Amino acid sequence: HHHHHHMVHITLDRNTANSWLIISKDRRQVRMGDTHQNVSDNKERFSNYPMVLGAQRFSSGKMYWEVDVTQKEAWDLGVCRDSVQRKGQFSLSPENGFWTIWLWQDSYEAGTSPQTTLHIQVPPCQIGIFVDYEAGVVSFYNITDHGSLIYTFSECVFAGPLRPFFNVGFNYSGGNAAPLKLCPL
Numbered sequence: 001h002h003h004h005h006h007m008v009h010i011t012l013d014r015n016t017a018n019s020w021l022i023i024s025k026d027r028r029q030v031r032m033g034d035t036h037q038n039v040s041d042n043k044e045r046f047s048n049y050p051m052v053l054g055a056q057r058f059s060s061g062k063m064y065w066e067v068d069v070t071q072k073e074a075w076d077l078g079v080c081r082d083s084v085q086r087k088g089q090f091s092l093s094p095e096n097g098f099w100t101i102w103l104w105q106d107s108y109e110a111g112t113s114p115q116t117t118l119h120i121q122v123p124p125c126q127i128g129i130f131v132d133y134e135a136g137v138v139s140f141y142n143i144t145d146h147g148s149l150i151y152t153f154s155e156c157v158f159a160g161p162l163r164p165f166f167n168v169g170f171n172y173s174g175g176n177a178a179p180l181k182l183c184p185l
């Protein structure tokens, strides 16, 4: 792909984070803590899952960023509406305002309803995410495999400002402690 020139500098929004997440000083890395991180509750925090939003809001244009997923067993990545549900249980779907892919139990799937199997020969260590607001497109790229396409959501109905979306996943196994990292431009 040739989307690198739309690169944007994403930072994480501490106020949206699940209360167990630990965000680095530079707001570029996030990981699951082994306990509550001693923050107050607020209506923005994701309560049920280890999720956080980017601070940036997008309502036009073309945007590109990259995320490092090295040594993780489970994660979700993509974009979502600014007005997604924060509290309680929900599924990641375009109907609920999410355009995401994930790793879970050694398989990769796109967050359609129902979910779509992805075909990845080279497990990615870094994911590229491309958003074309006007076209209604969210695309995912395998940076480890020379930028090969993973998945394209087209005919997207964003219906609001978009935010970068992250889920570090649970660490029930002891094998999923590694962080998500926003990779330099």
Ligand SMILES: CC1(C)CN(c2ncccc2F)C[C@@H]1O
Residues within 6 Å of the ligand: 041, 042, 043, 044, 047, 087, 088
């Ligand atoms: C008392 C809070 C800090 C948490 N809260 C809620 N948390 C989970 C489910 C439903 C809620 F209304 C409302 C308010 O923002």
